[PDB]
Symmetry: C2
Subunit: 384 residues, 2 copies
């Protein structure tokens, strides 16, 4: 049916979320995540001031046409703000389509390819032992996979961290050796290098950690230049993951087609929604590349519900990141996905199974918060 | 000197502009264009809510560090909203540095490479004849180059919400060569003639057109095909020697690195306000120069006099300058943005005032409230949402 109303909701139940809600003339509604961490109000404005008014009166069933209308119609294509706005609309429209079909989203997409969706948890410590304790506690929660991180020896506005590549490189292998010593070989172990290396440095790290058989080594190098992955891929057999900072298939087409990565990390709310990410996943599948959606707290339960539905259907699923939201957040975004024994189970309610309690949301006003920056020991502004 | 204040100014003296002003503890100020046509408030919010607060107290002289701080620090990199915000800061900081150095921006950049900067004018008509009359009017004004567009038998942001146009590729391909033939027939060979295909063709269609217009020796054929996939240019380049221009919709060197390195284009069109400012555009221009590629900055009304003045300075220094688009701003716009660049005999002359030579009259700017205006969309005859 026709779109009668559309508007954003901004709320901060432990952290900032922006949500787009679309309401048809029949009263059926859908919501989509529009949260872009540290730049939230840019997306809110992109929506409120430019997209939202153009949605009014459109046929809500025309998902593809609306995607193209917003993507091409913007004239200025791609980008974090642009593609997050588009994702929010797309996610809301799929929510409405699934409701109209009377099916949970995963059925609409082609049905379930699996009975449960494997997640990984974050295990972080100041020391290696601190980290190991976190691994133990997540293993007990039923997690089959853990991302491990420990300190390297030696906020409203961005916090400023200090970084040393060489100290990190000499130290990191010790962490994975420790994990394997304590927990053995069955456990999937992931590591996020978080953009801090050059390609030949990452190649060195990849080789160094081969004996520990990592599930992936993530975001080795900044990849605006996709060729950056080539030296890494040519020098190590440690699996590679990338893409949480991407927003377009055009950010990763070459990475995938040249087989320079094993996992694509771009999530629904930043990658143009269901419509676009279906195309990204399908391109990946031609090259044995699997999905590994970014799943931090800064993607709302709306994205997570939609992602679990997507994960349930997509043939080339790899893994789903899990960073639990706060109780307050979960309360603001009632949902029917559930977590059991290290895995998500998709909801059965028509739609993506997530809603937003607007009354509750209104109790948590926006509070500005920025991501940190990283500087080298000489002060050079680096990659965080 | 530290940044004491920073804030945006929104004004609509004939069309919308967003401007960033940065004021240092000494009271010296600098401005930068932040205008993103049809999405203006997204950049205003990006600046107001997330960038401006972080600028206070920063060393205004650290242009490079601030660029990297905003680019890398945002975590989410590239994009039209993102890079336009960064460009506004960068442009304002270069303005302040030039003022501090007591020289016009072109001097700071390495000095004058030319005595004047050639422009082209927009010439449009419903009929070929109408267009030819516009060509004549502009040659009399002293323009040495013209971009020609006419109707196909069978201020772009002109509506609050997007207008919907209808398009036929086949009709355009059959018609366009007739326009150029007529232009050459009437005006001869000396005149530079440009044409903007404006994203509508597939590569083999653009290859066909490029070949068809070879006899008319166009200065460039612009935006033949959407180029998110940079490989899109390859078939065109392999099939025609008509020169190619691309990039007004780009915001990053990573949007055009392969285009340039493979020699698939002759002119790069990404302008200062959308391509991350002077800092980023120096690097793009320099990459281009290795491959004989020249600058052809987008210069529509929707880039403010602030951008234009800085662009004219940039154009004056950059060795691999190609041409500067000129779409004249309204008298009201020129009044809100006093500037010392001048247009004479088809060319721009850079100003001599320290800074980029442009300022904003805030009192006058406040007299023209924001008015939403959207770019049109384009649909094929069957209703397919196409490229405008
Ligand atoms: Mg990560
Ligand atoms: Mg153009």
């Amino acid at each position: 049916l026709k779109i009668r109303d559309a508007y954003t909701i901004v709320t901060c139940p432990g952290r900032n979320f922006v949500t787009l809600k679309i309401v048809t003339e029949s009263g059926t509604h859908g919501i989509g995540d529009a949260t872009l961490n540290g730049r939230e109000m840019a997306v809110a404005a992109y929506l409120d001031e430019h997209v939202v008014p153009a949605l009014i009166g459109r046929d809500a069933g025309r998902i593809e046409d609306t995607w193209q209308y917003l993507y091409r119609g913007a004239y200025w294509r791609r980008g974090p703000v642009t593609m997050t706005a588009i994702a929010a609309v797309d996610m809301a429209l799929w929510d409405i389509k699934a409701k109209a079909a009377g099916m949970p989203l995963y059925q609409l997409l082609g049905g379930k390819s699996r009975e449960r969706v494997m997640t990984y948890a974050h295990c972080t410590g100041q020391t290696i032992e601190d980290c190991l304790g976190e691994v133990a506690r997540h293993v007990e929660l039923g997690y089959r996979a853990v991302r491990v991180q420990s300190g390297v020896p030696g906020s409203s506005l961005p916090a400023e961290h200090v970084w040393s590549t060489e100290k990190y490189l000499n130290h990191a292998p010790k962490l994975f050796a420790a994990v394997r010593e304590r927990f053995g070989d069955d456990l999937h172990v992931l590591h996020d290098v978080h953009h801090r290396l050059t390609p030949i440095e990452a190649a060195r790290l990849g080789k160094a950690v081969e004996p520990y058989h990592l599930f992936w080594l993530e975001d080795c190098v900044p990849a605006e230049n996709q060729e950056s992955l080539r030296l890494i891929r040519e020098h190590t057999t440690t699996p590679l993951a990338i893409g949480e900072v991407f927003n377009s298939i055009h950010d990763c087409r070459e990475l995938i087609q040249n087989q320079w990565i094993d996992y694509i990390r771009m999530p629904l709310t930043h990658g143009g929604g269901i419509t676009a990410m279906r195309r990204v996943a399908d391109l990946a599948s031609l090259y044995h590349v699997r999905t590994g959606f970014h799943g931090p707290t800064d993607l709302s339960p709306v994205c997570l519900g939609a992602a679990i539905h997507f994960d349930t259907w997509v043939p080339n699923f790899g893994i789903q990141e899990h960073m639990p939201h706060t109780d307050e957040t979960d309360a603001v975004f009632p949902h029917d996905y559930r977590f059991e024994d290290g895995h998500f189970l998709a909801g059965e309610s028509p739609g993506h199974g997530v809603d937003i309690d607007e009354e509750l949301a209104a109790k948590y006003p926006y509070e500005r918060a920025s991501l940190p920056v990283n500087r080298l020991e000489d002060g050079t502004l680096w990659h965080w």
